[PDB]
Structure formats: structure tokens, C-alpha cells
Amino acid sequence: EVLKPRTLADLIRILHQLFAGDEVNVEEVQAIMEAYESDPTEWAMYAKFDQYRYTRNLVDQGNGKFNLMILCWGEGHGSSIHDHTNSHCFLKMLQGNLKETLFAWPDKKSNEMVKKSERVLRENQCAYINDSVGLHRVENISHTEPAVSLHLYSPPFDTCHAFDQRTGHKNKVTMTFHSKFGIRTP
């Protein structure tokens, strides 16, 4: 009964509609992102990897309502523990598998951070997080295979915080794009 996009372009078009309003039904968006069957022929143009770090590849700016980007995780690549700057954040697997570790928020006291959940995102699965849910970190589970994920952030944002797992202390980080619309950035 979920509206099923048949192509990445269908999905983007549906997303333009679901985020046209002031209200966003989170479960609705999650189910539609998940219903799209990852087709590498459709997103290979965005699948630009790097030897040492994961890459952020902009796909669509969602008429100022969201960023839709593709993240390419090389062998063993992972993120830091990070927050999401008060936005809705949807994460769908396109290839491979990411381990998501949910953390609790630190307070002012220095302390080892606390895991609240640990899971593997399956093929085509769409996960969701926001700041009230927790912090998280994502990691390619594989040291022999890449992972590719599709991310929708609403409203868009280009700064967040990274957290040190040993203490909980945090630093501001400016996110950069490795490529936009299939074109490498400077």
C-alpha cells in the first residue's frame, strides 16, 4: 500500500511533494524511501569514492526543503559520533551494510560515552534519526566491500558536531561535498 518509486527520479519527485508542506510525516517518508529498490545503474553517476575517507555526493537540493546526498563508504570507512543540527535525517542503504551505533548525549562532565543501540542496516533499509533520538556513528561493516547510502536531511544543514567517545567533548565540523550533481568539487 506504500507508494513505490520505480526509479531514483520517481523517489526525488515524490520527496519534492512530501516536503512541499509544513508537516513531514516521518514514517510515511521512511516507508517510501525504503520502497525504492536501489538500482546502481541509476546512481552510479554519484558513486565517487576516495581511498581514505567516505565521500558526500550531492544529488538534489529539494527546492530548499532538504538535501538528498549519496555517501560512499570505502573498505572499513566510518563516520565519527555526531549530531544532526535539529533536522530530520533519513538514511537508506543503496549497497553494502552500515553498522549504526546510537549513543546518548554527554553532559558537561567528562566521561566515556554510552551506547544505547547497535544494529546493522540491511539492504534497501531506511533508518531515521534526529537530535532527540540520540547521537550516532555509522561504519561500513566490510573491509573487502564498499557501502553506499542515500541520505535526506530536512532542513538542509552543513555544520554539525563530532563527539570524542572517551570524554564526550565535542567539536564543530563543517561538512563538505566531494561532488554535486555528479561533478567533482574543487
Ligand SMILES: [Fe+2]
Ligand atoms: Fe548521521
